[PDB]
Amino acid sequence: AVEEIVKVSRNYQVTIPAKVRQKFQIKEGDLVKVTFDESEGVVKIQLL
Amino acid sequence: AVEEIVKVSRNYQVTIPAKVRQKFQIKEGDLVKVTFDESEGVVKIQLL
């Protein structure tokens, strides 16, 4: 259960912390899909 | 789906777009949980 609690920035960004990036290996410039999940009430971030 | 493709920002930040924020009420300084979901291979952002 790899997870970390973070603060939302002024311009509504969320940092994906190092702990999570060991599993979800994103870099500045990558494209990701950001979806509101209507059954879980969470936001999902998926790699393209 | 309520979703948008976004580019990862410098310093590993991902914008939660306005389209998504209409459903997922977040404000500057809110604390959120960032989780890797192994069943799906995606990151989930959860309100705390």
Side-chain angles (χ1 to χ4, degrees):
Chain A
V2 182
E3 55 195 16
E4 189 160 343
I5 295 167
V6 304
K7 197 181 192 117
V8 178
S9 75
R10 175 75 180 176
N11 290 307
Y12 304 107
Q13 304 198 102
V14 173
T15 295
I16 310 301
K19 188 200 314 197
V20 175
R21 293 186 318 264
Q22 289 284 290
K23 312 295 266 181
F24 190 79
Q25 300 197 326
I26 55 176
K27 298 273 181 224
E28 184 179 354
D30 283 357
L31 302 176
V32 290
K33 183 176 64 175
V34 184
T35 304
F36 178 65
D37 190 297
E38 291 166 40
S39 56
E40 299 173 40
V42 301
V43 168
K44 294 185 181 190
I45 307 180
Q46 181 196 305
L47 303 176
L48 300 195
Chain B
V2 175
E3 67 195 4
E4 187 163 331
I5 299 170
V6 332
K7 197 172 187 71
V8 175
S9 291
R10 188 174 182 165
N11 305 315
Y12 308 99
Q13 296 175 289
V14 179
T15 296
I16 311 307
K19 182 206 299 209
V20 177
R21 302 183 319 254
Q22 294 192 14
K23 311 311 290 201
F24 186 79
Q25 316 295 244
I26 50 170
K27 309 204 177 204
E28 180 185 13
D30 278 355
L31 296 176
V32 291
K33 190 180 325 202
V34 180
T35 307
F36 184 67
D37 182 280
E38 263 107 7
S39 81
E40 296 179 28
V42 304
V43 163
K44 298 181 172 190
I45 310 301
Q46 308 126 276
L47 293 182
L48 297 175

